[PDB]
């Protein structure tokens, strides 16, 4: 439903942010 | 509705964050 | 409207985060 | 109340994130 | 528990973001 | 309660993001 799906979309966008931030960290110290 | 539309705007902004962070990761990767 | 205004302030802050991240990505791109 | 204050605290933490991201962008292109 | 699980996935993703940001900060510090 | 505790964990993680981003900003500033 509208609210459950909105929170899922927020979680998914934050997982994409987390992946990219780990890629940036890994470029500096991996 | 007001709550649904605010949660949609939060998801949209986070997707823009995610895309920019992917571009920063791409710039730093070998 | 306390709940709606707090979600709108979260969206506003994330839009500022997205603007700044896009500025960082542009600074690093060719 | 518990939920209104929690969302305010989330907005405040995101404003601090936004300020720091703008400082990073400004260090690169200001 | 769909609403609680989506908020917990948001927290999980943000903890991953925080870990990666701390790794970036450590890479840049003296 | 479950919703209150998830929102507290989201705020805590974002404060950790904010602190790390402040440290990255400090590293890059003159």
Author numbering:
A (entry chain A), B (entry chain C), C (entry chain B), D (entry chain A), E (entry chain B), F (entry chain C): 1 to 30
From the paper:
Despite the requirements for aliphatic residues at a and d, up to 40% of these can be changed to other side chains without compromising barrel integrity. We introduced mutations at one or two of these sites to generate four groups of αHB: Group I had entirely hydrophobic interiors, but with different sizes and shapes of channel; Groups II and III had polar uncharged or polar charged residues, respectively, at specific points along the channel; and Group IV had aromatic residues installed in their channels. The eleven Group II peptides comprised: single mutants to Cys, His, Asn, Ser or Thr at d sites; and double mutations to His, Asn, Ser or Thr at consecutive a and d sites. Finally, one third of the designs were crystallized and yielded 12 X-ray crystal structures, all of which were open αHBs with fully accessible channels.
αHBs are oligomers of 5 or more α-helical peptides that assemble into coiled-coil structures with central solvent-accessible channels.
